[PDB]
Amino acid sequence: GVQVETISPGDGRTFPKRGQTCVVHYTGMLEDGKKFDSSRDRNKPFKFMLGKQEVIRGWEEGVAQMSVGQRAKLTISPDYAYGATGHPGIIPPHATLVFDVELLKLE
Amino acid sequence: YVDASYSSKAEKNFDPRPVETLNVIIPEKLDSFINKFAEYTHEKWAFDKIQNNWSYGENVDEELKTHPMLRPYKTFSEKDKEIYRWPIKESLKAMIAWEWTIEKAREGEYNPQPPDLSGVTLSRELQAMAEQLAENYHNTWGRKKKQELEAKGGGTHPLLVPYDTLTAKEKARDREKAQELLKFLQMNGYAVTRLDTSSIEKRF
Amino acid sequence: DGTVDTPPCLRLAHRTWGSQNSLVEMLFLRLSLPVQFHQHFRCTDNRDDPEIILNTTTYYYSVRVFAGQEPSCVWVGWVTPDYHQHDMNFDLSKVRAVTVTMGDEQGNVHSSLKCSNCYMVWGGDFVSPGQQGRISHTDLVIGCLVDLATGLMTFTANGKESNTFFQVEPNTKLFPAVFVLPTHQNVIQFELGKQKNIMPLSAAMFLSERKNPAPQCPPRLEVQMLMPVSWSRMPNHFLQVETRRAGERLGWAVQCQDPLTMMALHIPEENRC
Amino acid sequence: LFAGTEHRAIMVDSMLHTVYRLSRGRSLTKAQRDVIEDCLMALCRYIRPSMLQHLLRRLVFDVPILNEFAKMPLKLLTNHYERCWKYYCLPTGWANF
Amino acid sequence: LLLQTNLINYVTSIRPNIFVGRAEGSTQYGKWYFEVMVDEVVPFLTAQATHLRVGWALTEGYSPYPGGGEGWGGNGVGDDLYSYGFDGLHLWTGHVARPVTSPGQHLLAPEDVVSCCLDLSVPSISFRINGCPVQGVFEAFNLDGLFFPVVSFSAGVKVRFLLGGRHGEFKFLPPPGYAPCHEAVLPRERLRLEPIKEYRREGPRGPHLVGPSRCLSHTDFVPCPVDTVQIVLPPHLERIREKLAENIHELWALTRIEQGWTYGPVRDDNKRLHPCLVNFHSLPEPERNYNLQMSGETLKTLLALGCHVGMADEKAEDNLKKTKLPKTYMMSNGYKPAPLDLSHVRLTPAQTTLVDRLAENGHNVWARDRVAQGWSYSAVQDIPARRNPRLVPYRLLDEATKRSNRDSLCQAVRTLLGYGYNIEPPDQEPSQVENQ
């Protein structure tokens, strides 16, 4: 349930594989247009490693399809995010999440 | 300031003198219009009923709040037709008594298909005569009204004032009636004839 | 208040009609709360059925044009939260409209959406050309139906379905609105009622009343009028924009480098900040 | 107290005509006549100019006669137009009138 | 329920002073084209993405104020129903972003060229990025105003307007039938880049407060000559109407002699040859009758404007001096044209105002006649394309040409006064247009 729509092209050659740390800058909004999270506000890039289930499964496939330097828009269905339980106080249940993710680098 | 009605009677409580025309003989050479338009005004009342959204009826009744004896010409008795012409008869007497000769330039001739309206404009010289005739409507109306009122000697009707003094809202009654007669004379081509002042010369 | 035979209403009256110094001009009214269409649309006696009424997504409200108010000077419908057209000579031709058309590499239009900020009907379309008596004995009761699960909007003249209809996109916010030029002491009346197997507006405006078929007029719901001018605060700093003619072949250059940020307070129901 | 009687203009206009008609009354003593005239002068000083239109219409018929009864209307007209000259002359009219 | 807060960037719009529109009888062309080239964009100068949109906006309604507004602020092109923008990935209108497909979709980046086409006939707005068509068009929108190019942006951008001609060479050839936007600049104004409805600007000693700005309307480009349906000229005016055409032709021929025109079988401005540049009588009658229709209106407009004119003097017409061209200032033919000598003639200040009104009407009559023939206004003259720099209403005309028409009408009035005919200046009726 992840759809990846490109915003700005990357290198198109290097892609993140399993066990590699991904450094991304993201801004997450509900699909109706309400923002709820953004790494830009904290002014600190978000780091995570693929395959360790550190993030929601929607980010697992979405970032894997992106290249280094690419900025893309990921639309994640409720099943590939928090879903029925949701995130209490942040994300309502059965909410589709839209993310503007830029893959800064891999480490 | 320029007065819209730049004219006056230049005459003289208030006694509205009517116009004496019964003494003088009424010319009947134009009887093709005298009788036709006399019943045409009441024919226009039939068109006024369909605009009232309540149609005409034969039986006399006070529930229809319209004319109770208005009937189609097939079953329209002429007893009312032969009494509604009197206001028109004196109306033609009135406009011909004020040294206004009328000449028929042209030579020709249940719903009044030709619609008589009053929203169109007209020339100043000819419209001035209509307003003068409308004045004669008011003073004759004032004369008969004051005859009943003069039996008391105290008070007066609020509209017992000269025609030029009363405002337009209370004038539209006689104004439209005189204009409507002139409009009928307009499309047929009746020439009635007995000034040219610019707006600058009309300033106070 | 809603009686046994009438629903709760918000009636507008002209205080100084007929008297000297009375103000007569186009009046743009709307209700204070919107109805929001669903995020996703569905694919493809006189008693409400309990199962139908609890599963329907159609909502109804009506406007009563009192006798004496000319229907030709009344417009009834909905407005989006971005309506700012204070036209003293308003008619349906002044309504903002635009069509966005998408296609493939060679024509072949596959999507043609229609956008507007005002979805209304003219009261002059619901009057027969009678000879006269245009001020009718019966008040004109224009009803509006919105289906939040399909984005379809329909109207009724006096219980007869009208030909005009509108289609809107999901997540659209619509405010019940009436544009009227007063011609009588009694002008209009928002009727927050319901039809058979159709929920009232209070069921759509409030989360706690989604399954309540009883019409309600809570205090937050009120009539709002369009005010042409309002006070606004001037920003303390403005973007420094440099404009110059770079040359005959380079054209005119626009440049802005220094960032500026403001803290915006957003009102959710009005979709403005 | 007659300053804002626009809502009852019909009754106020009738009052003005009656008191004026009383002034033009035979079998009235000189002392009685001035009391009627003083009342008419006082009323026209506070009544709005728009509500004096009908009274002026009656005066147009009577004042040009210039008989012995025309003395009071001449003074009444003098005070009216001196007080309300902006109502008739200025294109914008008198303020709030 | 609770009020929401967030940090947003300020967005400002910049437009050229180029205004186009469509109206019945308007003198403006229908199809326009311009380009915007992106030189430098910082994708994230702040926590919020950089704003950059290109498109068209309507004069009556598009007033983006700095700060708050619809949605979450930062309103630019396409954030209302008066503007239609394009940011590289979406078509913006009514504060709604609709994705659009183009070869190599990406957000507006440096070295990108955006081509915007405006066809008011449909009406339709289309875009091209780097020469490839954008598969999405705005259409069936309102036309009650004037359209201008506009770019909305936040801090961290650097773009250049390409308007054609000497104001930015086009990177790509415009589609056939479309005209460069530089041709739409009015004669009285110079092309420049300005903000939109600003209430504040920088000044020498401090910020300057600015009130509302006077804006033109689409109806301002529609000539409105006075009505001349009432074609009833007095017989003395009718006969002198043709003689008026004789005199104005000589005056028009005389002014051409100052410009260097000589007699010639061919009538060309550059060749400076004119068959009329011999004499009014030697001028061919059919050529004289070319302006007889215009000459008839000139006297007719006097009656139409309300002027009282009659044959006050007949002996004055019989005897009058004739100015002749100097023998030194001769044409190819060598004859001396003899226009009426009216040096002794003087005009009252009220009559001078009448000449201005006559000149304005004469231009409008010519303007609406050309519009019916398909002519349209353009900064650059193109006879095969029927584009004329003077195809504009008289009020929008530049003073240099405005004075030229005024002088010609003055001689025509002088000719009437030379004949001794009385000319009564009408009592001018003031009016308030209420443009805004």
Ligand SMILES: Nc1ncnc2c1ncn2[C@@H]1O[C@H](COP(=O)(O)OP(=O)(O)OP(=O)(O)O)[C@@H](O)[C@H]1O
């Ligand atoms: N009959 C007319 N024909 C042409 N222009 C006229 C006429 N009457 C007035 N004008 C004015 O002349 C100007 C335009 O003239 P135009 O461009 O046609 O001149 P030209 O090129 O010298 O003439 P031509 O096209 O006959 O060679 C405008 O200001 C217009 O108002």
Ligand SMILES: COc1ccc2c(c1)CN(Cc1ccc(C(=O)O)cc1)CCS2
């Ligand atoms: C006001 O009136 C005008 C104003 C300007 C011009 C003309 C007539 C003339 N027209 C063509 C023309 C030229 C010469 C003659 C002639 O000499 O007979 C007739 C017509 C366009 C050229 S500029």
